[PDB]
Design an enzyme around this catalytic site. Sequence first.
Site, PDB file in Angstrom:
ATOM      1  N   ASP A 285       0.849  -1.201   0.000  1.00 24.82           N
ATOM      2  CA  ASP A 285       0.000   0.000   0.000  1.00 24.82           C
ATOM      3  C   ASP A 285       0.882   1.248   0.000  1.00 24.82           C
ATOM      4  O   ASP A 285       2.030   1.205  -0.473  1.00 24.82           O
ATOM      5  CB  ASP A 285      -0.858  -0.225   1.262  1.00 24.82           C
TER       6      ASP A 285
ATOM      7  N   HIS B 227      -3.631   5.540   4.360  1.00 24.28           N
ATOM      8  CA  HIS B 227      -4.314   4.274   3.940  1.00 24.28           C
ATOM      9  C   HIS B 227      -3.652   2.990   4.410  1.00 24.28           C
ATOM     10  O   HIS B 227      -4.260   2.041   4.959  1.00 24.28           O
ATOM     11  CB  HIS B 227      -4.489   4.365   2.401  1.00 24.28           C
TER      12      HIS B 227
ATOM     13  N   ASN C  95     -14.280  -0.226  -5.553  1.00 20.87           N
ATOM     14  CA  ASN C  95     -15.390   0.558  -4.984  1.00 20.87           C
ATOM     15  C   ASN C  95     -16.234   1.250  -6.035  1.00 20.87           C
ATOM     16  O   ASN C  95     -16.817   2.282  -5.655  1.00 20.87           O
ATOM     17  CB  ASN C  95     -14.812   1.669  -4.064  1.00 20.87           C
TER      18      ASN C  95
ATOM     19  N   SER D 133     -11.039  -1.879   0.322  1.00 20.64           N
ATOM     20  CA  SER D 133      -9.659  -1.953   0.841  1.00 20.64           C
ATOM     21  C   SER D 133      -9.675  -2.048   2.389  1.00 20.64           C
ATOM     22  O   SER D 133      -8.661  -2.548   2.884  1.00 20.64           O
ATOM     23  CB  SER D 133      -8.858  -0.750   0.425  1.00 20.64           C
TER      24      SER D 133
END
Length: 269
Positions: free
Chosen positions: A32, A62, A153, A215
């Site tokens: 990430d 994140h 998403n 996520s």
Amino acid sequence: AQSVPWGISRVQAPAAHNRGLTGSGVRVAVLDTGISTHPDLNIRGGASFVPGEPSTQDGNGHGTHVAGTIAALNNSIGVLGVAPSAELYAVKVLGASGSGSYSSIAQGLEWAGNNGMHVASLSLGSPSPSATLEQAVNSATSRGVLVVAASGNSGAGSISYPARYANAMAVGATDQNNNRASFSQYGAGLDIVAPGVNVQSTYPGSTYASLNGTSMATPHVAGAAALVKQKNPSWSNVQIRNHLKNTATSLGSTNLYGSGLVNAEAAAR
Ligand SMILES: [Ca+2]
Ligand SMILES: [Ca+2]
């Protein structure tokens, strides 16, 4: 005081911790934006594949959030991960702005397979396939890594790459009603779902924040895989992946939910 985010109790992680399964000795890589040092995380190591950001520290937030769902430490502060004893590795493949090349992501997967990681959690997605990516996925897989990726998403009835690839375990997101969250992509290739709405986790600046996304769902499954691995040390990536699906709670359509909601208690038994 430590709090248990609703998602953690939804997947029944505490029931597994009560039997002694915490993820101990399982190596988990978070691909990430990095992972920031945090009092509720234990970061064992990592690498950055982002030119321009040689450090594994997270400038986005994140990665730190994802890491805390997997393994926030079981103590008297903050939150609690699904596998609080997992060996956490920060694999920075996305820069602070949240983007990066298929090339960087591929390097992070290669790294994972070269460094004997058991599970790789990938937060990224793409509506387009990538041969580079696909190859890295397959290469990590044949080196024993279980690759877990988010469905995306967009809310579309088709899932993103690399989650769409056969060797990636694709995870969608559910709400507190056990319904599919509106933004969660579904369809062909979807393997399982987990909590993805209002997920509270570790965040840079030594704080905690609540986010939504597929996520956020992914790390619940990455963590459940570390519990199963601890319980069955000789199982391979494939064995773990099928066991998760086999023990998931049916939620209705496999088109919308795949195997259903991951159940860490049922799986780590
Ligand atoms: Ca904690
Ligand atoms: Ca898949």
